[PDB]
Amino acid sequence: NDALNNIINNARDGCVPLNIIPLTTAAKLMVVIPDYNTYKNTCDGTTFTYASALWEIQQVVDADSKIVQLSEISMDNSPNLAWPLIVTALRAN
Amino acid sequence: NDALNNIINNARDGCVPLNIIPLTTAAKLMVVIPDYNTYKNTCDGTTFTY
Amino acid sequence: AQSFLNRVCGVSAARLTPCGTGTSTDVVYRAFDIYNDKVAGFAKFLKTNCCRFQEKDEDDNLIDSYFVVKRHTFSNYQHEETIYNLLKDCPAVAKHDFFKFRIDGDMVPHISRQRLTKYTMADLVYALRHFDEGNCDTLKEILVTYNCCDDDYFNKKDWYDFVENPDILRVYANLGERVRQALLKTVQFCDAMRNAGIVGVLTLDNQDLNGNWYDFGDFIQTTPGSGVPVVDSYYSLLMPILTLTRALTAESHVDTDLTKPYIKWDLLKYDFTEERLKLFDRYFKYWDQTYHPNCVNCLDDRCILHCANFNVLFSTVFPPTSFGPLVRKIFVDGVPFVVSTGYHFRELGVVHNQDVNLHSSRLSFKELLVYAADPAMHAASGNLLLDKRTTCFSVAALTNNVAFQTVKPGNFNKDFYDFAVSKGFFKEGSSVELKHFFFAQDGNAAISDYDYYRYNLPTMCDIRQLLFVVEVVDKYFDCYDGGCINANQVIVNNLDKSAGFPFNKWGKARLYYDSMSYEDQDALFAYTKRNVIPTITQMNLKYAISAKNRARTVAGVSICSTMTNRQFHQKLLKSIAATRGATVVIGTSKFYGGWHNMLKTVYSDVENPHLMGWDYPKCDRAMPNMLRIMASLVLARKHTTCCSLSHRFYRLANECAQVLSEMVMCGGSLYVKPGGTSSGDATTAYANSVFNICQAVTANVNALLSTDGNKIADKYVRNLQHRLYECLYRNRDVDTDFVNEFYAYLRKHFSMMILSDDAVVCFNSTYASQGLVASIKNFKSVLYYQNNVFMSEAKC
Amino acid sequence: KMSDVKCTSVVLLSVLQQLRVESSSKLWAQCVQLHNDILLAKDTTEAFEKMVSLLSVLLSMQGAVDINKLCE
Amino acid sequence: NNELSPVALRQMSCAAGTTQTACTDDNALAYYNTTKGGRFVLALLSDLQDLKWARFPKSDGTGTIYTELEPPCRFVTDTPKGPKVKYLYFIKGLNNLNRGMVLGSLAATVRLQ
Ligand SMILES: [Mn+2]
Ligand SMILES: [Mn+2]
Ligand SMILES: [Zn+2]
């Protein structure tokens, strides 16, 4: 409720759209990526920027819910991974 | 079916595929031949009948 | 010959190339919007009093600039010259050149419009609204002459389709800036007419694609400063093009210029009421109907539809993060809660709940159910979701891992199959073979099918045409009766069905129809009459036998939405599914001769009968939000007594927030539904039925209007077309006499058999051949310009 | 024959699903594609090749005893 | 050929005023429209500078509707009777097409420069 109150009290009358509460005050971001071409654009490296914030990856899993390391996300190693890759990141500060 | 019967008999007695066998003429296949009998029955020179 | 060319090249642009045969006219097949006391409509005619001379650039290079010189009578010549001199100072007016040129033995007057495009605005509007892939050459020329695409783009098959090749949206969007400039020039022209005291009716055929205006032969002059530009037909016909070309895409920029970064709106900002009014004043300054940016302030359902049509166009500018539930922090037992105390619809504007408690002691069952059905708490308690598999706006991930639901293969029936092959079935070459199977689906199939909502585009409907189609559809839904029913009068079949999200965690609909007394359900239903309850719709993979490998998905609507929609609609729905011999055949059994009765009622009185069925591609996924709102309003037309105007509007808002733009729970995470039919709601079949009737009526209206009224031999049909144009773009209130007349005409010549998007029409073949009734091509064009799909004639 | 091979594909995907093949996203996706293409196939050559490819998945695992199930 | 309004209509004689029943016996030139749903008054035309409310009874007799007027429009018309300086009034909420019809009728039945 810290960032939640920060954005609620910053509203005109304490009312905000729902689509921005996870976009502003969520401590964890989950990114579902269908292929490596979208992975390199969005979740490049151990930290990436999205939704006007900085996110640092803490865990990447595949559709099998198996922890896959960042070194495994390669052009040549892409067909060896189940591909809806689900990268989970934490908010940076 | 000749191909189905062949792979079924191989899996019953000898070699089983280590991956999905492809149907295109570019991809590869990995099998597990456990003894010389199936090796001689299936392989002949550089060709492998499966 | 050569002297006439030089006379046309008066003082500028001497490099003109004759498109005709010298001093003779150039006959073209253009689209006009005529309404002159005999013939009315919006059809393609043959212009035979027009000499076209196309300007050429340096080094003899043809350019999109024509000197359309026309010869007319002396009175019209001088009248047009005077009104142009009154309007020549306006920048948004084609440079007119007036002179008398001797042709044979007399000085025939001529009017030379300068720097005109080959096709007018009406040509583009007709091409986009009466589209036909068999012959669409004006559209191709417009697309290639304005760098929208190349001629090589049309060589690709299904270049025009929306489901196949969605890049046609990007191709049409390149016409968006040109259409927006045409809108701005139209506003400037209206201002000039008002200030100069010129009274006339604006039509798309009098504006070229640059935006400049011409044809003043029907304008009349009055005292300056009191002029009135009659622009209803122009804007109304342009409305489908505005969203198809995304004309207001430049409004999402810092200075409304397509060279600046997208204007970074405040994330907390959701109202945009002032921005909508500014957009309306900028593009529809002289639209002579009050526009309510928030539909709570609308007068009736017709005004709701009218203002929602503008809101559809205006919401394409504002960020998608500013729509959906409007949430605020409330306190229960002194503990803060995040609940939706309002909603920001892309079509209904900003709606605020009336019974909002910022503080409370405790919530017993009703508020608990509302806040559980509310996506506010789940979205606020979930992890931010960036799902790149789909273009739909993701909201949050409720669980820490994405749930991949698969579809199992069917369970074989070896005994029955062996018995069948024993009876000589499934022989090699038999006319009967197994084509329907339980097609299996992989993990990323539910989200893949949910991404088909990308075919749901913000569609601005022809509002002056839609407001008449609504009246005709209401006449179709006249024999039925409906209204509010109490919780004790609600019939629920299969109480052991799932109850949306998150109510499926604790039990089926039986629990929530047993845990809630009749007074509890009545209180919840009356709450929706003055509040908005956004709900979470769970997307469920269908496990059923089909002939298509595509995954089938049904929408699991929450028990809070379904229970209230039952109390709001079930009376009308049961009346619809209790009536025999009606257009909608829901509830009519095919057994015991019922199929024969249905077909005989279809063949009611058609003089030259043919049977015609069509297909809506991605019907539940591509249905415009305007048409879904129209369906809900037509279903709400029965609440003249049980509901106030505020109650009806808030029920419509609940419909839109629950089954039109709700939070979908595909997989294990929330998403934003762009629109279309959430085909799991309490009115799925009946809403699809009214949508189908609306599409059929729109196709019939377009067939009547896009018909040469001079060539309509029948004097009754010609007058019907004239009065149809009058009731669409001239008459502002409902003409119940002509609404009944057109409804009777449709029943006599276009009798329908309507179920949920499945229809059979017994239509007068000799009328559809003459364009007096939609044959199949009017349906294709209507789907193209009002459903954002290409109706393949191989599915019809 | 064609109906026979389609029904065999159906039962083969059923036994694969019973063997937790869906626990492997890539393997299950390939099996689903093969099964759906066999049912949509029009000739008994492409369908039979895809049937061999799908059966290779079952033969690739140690969860099913191939000798015991071949009772003839 | 988008004509403004073919076969227009004429004006009727009725009483109007500046506030509610400020009509002594008759001071207006009400422009009517014989609509199929009943007679509809479109515009007012009076010699007085400012009018706000008029009383034009409906065909039922019992129901008389008080019409709110827009700000006056000033002009000079060249009639055979010499200068006829009337003030144009439009009923609040009137459509633009009705305004065009009224202006066309006024400019066709009265000579203008
Ligand atoms: Mn014209
Ligand atoms: Mn004209
Ligand atoms: Zn009601």
Domains in chain A, ordered, with CATH? Answer: 3-91 (3.30.70.3540)
Q: How is residue C483 written in tokens?
A: 């209204």
Q: Which amino acid is at C681?
A: D
Whether C569 and C687 have beta carbons less than 8 Å apart is answered as: no
Which residues are registered as beta bridge partners of C234?
A: none
Query: Does the beta-carbon distance from D10 to C437 stay under 8 Å?
Result: yes
Q: Which amino acid is at C313?
A: L
Tell the burial category of C690 from Cβ atoms under 10 Å away from its Cβ (0-12, 13-18, 19+). Answer: buried
Measured in degrees and rounded to the nearest 5, phi and psi for residue E105 equal: -65, -45
> Does the annotation place C387 within a ligand binding site?
no
Cα end-to-end distance, chain B, whole Å: 13
Helix C74-87 vs helix C176-196: angle between axes, to the nearest 10 degrees?
A: 100
The region, left, alpha or beta by phi > 0 then psi within -120 to 50, assigned to residue E2 is beta
Structure solved via: cryo-EM
**Pairwise CA distance, residues B49 & C594, whole Å:** 62
Task: Write the Ramachandran bin of A14: left for phi over 0, alpha for psi from -120 to 50, otherwise beta.
Answer: left
Using CA coordinates, name the residue in chain D closest to B18: D60
D65 part of contact set with chain B, CB < 8 Å: no
Mutate to test the interface with D, among A64, A78, A81 (most CBs of D within 10 A): A64
Domain boundaries, chain D: 1-72
Going by C-beta distance under 8 Å and a sequence separation of 6 or more, which residues neighbour residue C222?
C197, C198, C199, E103, E107
As a whole number of angstroms, the distance between CA C466 and CA C304 comes to 12
Closest by CA to C298, choosing from C346, C348, C253, is C348
Which of C271, C324, C388 has its CB closest to that of A18? C324
**Does C80 contact chain E (CB < 8 Å)?**
no
Residues 6+ apart with CB under 8 A from C312: C243, C346, C347, C458, C459, C460, C461, C624, C625, C626
Residue whose structure tokens are 């009068």: C489
D25 interaction partners in chain A (CB closer than 8 Å): 62-64, 82-84
If we measure between CA atoms, which residue out of C134, C76, C148, C86 comes closest to residue C108? C76
The single residue listed with the structure tokens 């929602």 is C308
| Among A15, A19, A29, beta carbon nearest to C320 | A19
What is the Å distance from ligand 3's center to C525 Cα?
10
Interface test with B, best of D28, D56, D68 (most B CBs within 10 A): D56
Residue closest to C67 by CA, chosen among C131, C24, C16: C16
Chains that touch C (3 or more CB pairs under 8 A): A, D, E
Which whole-number Å values give the CA distances from C428 to A23, C551, C635, in the listed order? 59, 29, 51
Question: What is the full DSSP assignment across E34-80?
Answer: EETTEEEEEEEEESSS---EEEEE-TTSS-EEEEEBPPPEE--EEET
CA distance C568 to C771: 40
If DSSP codes are grouped into helix, strand and coil, which group holds residue A37?
A: helix
Residue with tokens 């865990």, as numbered in its chain = A59
Q: What angle do CA C254, C255, C261 make, to 5 degrees?
A: 35
Cα–Cα distance, C11 to C98 (Å, whole number): 13
User: Assign residue A12 a region: left if phi > 0, alpha if psi is -120 to 50, beta otherwise?
Assistant: alpha
Contact D1 C428 (CB under 8 A): yes
Alpha-carbon torsion (C76, C80, C81, C86), positive or negative: positive
Which residues of chain A neighbour C382 with C-beta distances below 8 Å?
Answer: 22, 26
How far, in whole angstroms, is CA A36 from its chain's centroid? 15
Report strand pairing: A28-33 vs C383-387: parallel
Q: Is C190 annotated as a binding residue?
A: no
Cα C215 to averaged position of ligand 1 atoms, centre (Å) = 5
Q: Is C444 annotated as a binding residue?
A: no
Question: Is the Cβ of D57 closer than 8 Å to some Cβ of chain B?
Answer: yes
Query: Does the distance separating the beta carbons of D26 and A82 come in below 8 Å?
Result: yes
DSSP C411: P
CA angle C486, C492, C493 (to 5 degrees): 165
Nearest to E2 by CA among C204, C124, C211: C204
Q: Which of C657, C639, C282, C308 is nearest to C463 (CA)?
A: C308
Question: Between chain E and chain A, are at least 3 CB pairs below 8 A?
Answer: no
Burial of E9 (0-12, 13-18, 19+ CB in 10 A): middle
CB contact under 8 A, C220 and E73: no
- The angle subtended at Cα A80 by Cα A76 and Cα A81, nearest 5°, is 115
Residue A24, CA atoms < 13 Å, CB-side half-sphere: 20
| Sign of the CA dihedral running C646, C648, C650, C653 | negative
Residue C795 sits at φ, ψ, to 5 deg, of -100, 10
- Judge: D10–C410 Cβ closer than 8 Å, yes or no: yes
CA C633 to chain centre: 15
Helix (H) or strand (E) holding D9: helix D2-18
Q: Does C255 touch chain D (CB under 8 A)?
A: no
Are B20 and D50 in contact (CB < 8 Å)?
A: no
- Decide: C412 and D14 in contact? Cβ < 8 Å: yes
Nearest 5°: the CA angle C606, C610, C615 is 120
Q: Are the C-beta atoms of residues C617 and C792 closer than 8 Å to each other? A: yes
Q: Could you identify the residue written with the tokens 């995954």?
A: C551
How far is C761 from C746, CA to CA, in rounded Å? Answer: 10
CB C583 within 8 A of CB C476: yes
Which residues contact residue C341 at a Cβ distance below 8 angstroms, ignoring those fewer than 6 apart?
A15, C326, C327, C328, C330, C352, C353, C356
| Distance between CA atoms of residues C459 and C316, nearest Å | 10
Residues in chain E: 113
Q: Considering only CB atoms, which chain A residues are within 8 Å of C451?
A: none
Distance from CA of A83 to the nearest CA of C (A): 9
CB-based contact, D7 to chain B, within 8 Å: no
Provide the CB-side half-sphere exposure for C700 (13 A, CA). 29
Class of residue C599 by CB neighbours under 10 A (exposed 0-12, middle 13-18, buried 19+)? middle
Cis geometry, peptide bond prior to residue C534 (ω within 30 degrees of 0): no
Q: What are phi and psi of C27, to 5 degrees?
A: -75, 125
Residues in contact with C604: Cβ distance below 8 Å, sequence separation at least 6, in sequence order:
C747, C748, C751, C762
Question: Of C709, C652, C727, whose CA–CA distance to C39 is shortest?
Answer: C709
Residue C554 and residue C498 in contact, taking contact as beta carbons nearer than 8 Å: no
Task: Please name the helix (run of DSSP H) or strand (run of DSSP E) that holds residue C342, with its range, or none.
Answer: strand C335-345
Neighbours of C783 (CB within 10 A): 25
Structure tokens at E93: 């909420």
Question: Which one, of C137, C143, C136, C151, lies nearest residue C179 by Cα?
Answer: C143
- Ligand 2 centroid–CA A34 distance in Å is 57
Three-state SS annotation for C347-392: CCEEEECCCCCCEECCCCCHHHHHHHHCHHHHHHCCEEEEECCCCC
Nearest residue to B7 (alpha-carbon basis) of D12, C224, C232, C301: D12
- In terms of Cα–Cα distance, which of C6, C32, C22, C25 is closest to C68? C25
Q: Which chains touch B (3 or more CB pairs under 8 A)?
A: D
Which regions of D1-72 does DSSP assign to beta strands (E)?
Answer: none
Helices C463-476 and C301-315 cross at an angle (nearest 10°) of: 140
Query: How far apart, in whole angstroms, are the C-alpha atoms of residue C529 and residue A92?
Result: 44
Three-state DSSP state, C793: helix
* E95 near C CB under 8 A: yes
Show which residues of C are catalytic: 756-758
Residue (of C87, C110, C139) closest to C8 by Cα position: C110
SS3 C398: coil
**C-alpha dist (Å) from residue E25 to C26, C746, E32, E49:** 62, 51, 19, 18
Which of helix, strand or coil describes residue A24? helix
Residue C609: strand pairing partners:
C764
Backbone phi, then psi, for C339, in 5-degree steps?
-125, 155
Q: Which of C220, C232, C732 sits opposite E104 (nearest CB)?
A: C220
Smallest Cβ distance to D6: which of C404, C434, C440?
C434
CB-CB under 8 Å, A30 with C270: no
Report resolution (Å) to 1 decimal. Answer: 2.8
> For residues B21 and B1, what is the distance between their CA atoms, to the nearest angstrom?
16
Q: Do the annotations mark residue C727 as ligand-binding?
A: no
Compare all CA atoms of chain E with the CA of C223 and give the residue at the minimum distance: E75
Contact C632, C344 (CB under 8 A): no
Among candidate residues C245, C213, C244, the one with its CA nearest the CA of residue C231: C213
What's the DSSP call for residue C604? S
CA C495 to mean position of chain CA atoms: 35
Pairing of strands A47-50, A53-61: antiparallel
Q: Which residues of C touch A22 (CB under 8 A)?
A: 379-380, 382-385, 395-396
- Placement of tokens 């009606």 in the chain: C582
- The structure tokens 């076969």 sit at E7
Say how many residues make up chain D.
72
| Cα distance between residue E77 and residue E75, in whole Å | 7
The residues, any chain, with a CB within 8 Å of residue C470's CB and separated by 6 or more, are C301, C302, C305, C630, C633, C634, C694
Contact: A82, D23; criterion CB under 8 Å: no
CB–CB contact D48 B3 (8 Å): yes
C90 is in an annotated binding site: no
**Residues from chain A contacting residue C385 (CB–CB below 8 Å):** 22, 29-32
- Look up tokens 């209507």; give the residue: C782
- Put simply, the answer to whether C441 touches D32 (Cβ < 8 Å) is yes
Question: How many CB atoms neighbour CB C743 within 10 A?
Answer: 18
What crossing angle do the helices spanning C645-659 and C625-635 adopt, rounded to 10°? 140
How far apart (Å, rounded) are the C-alpha atoms in residues C514 and E47? 73
Nearest to C308 by CA among C782, C777, C661: C661
β-strand C107-116 against C95-102: which pairing, if any? antiparallel
| Chain C environment of D31 (Cβ under 8 Å) | 440
Strand-strand pairing, C609-612 and C553-556: unpaired
Using an 8 Å CB-CB cutoff, list chain C residues near E96: 228-232, 286, 288
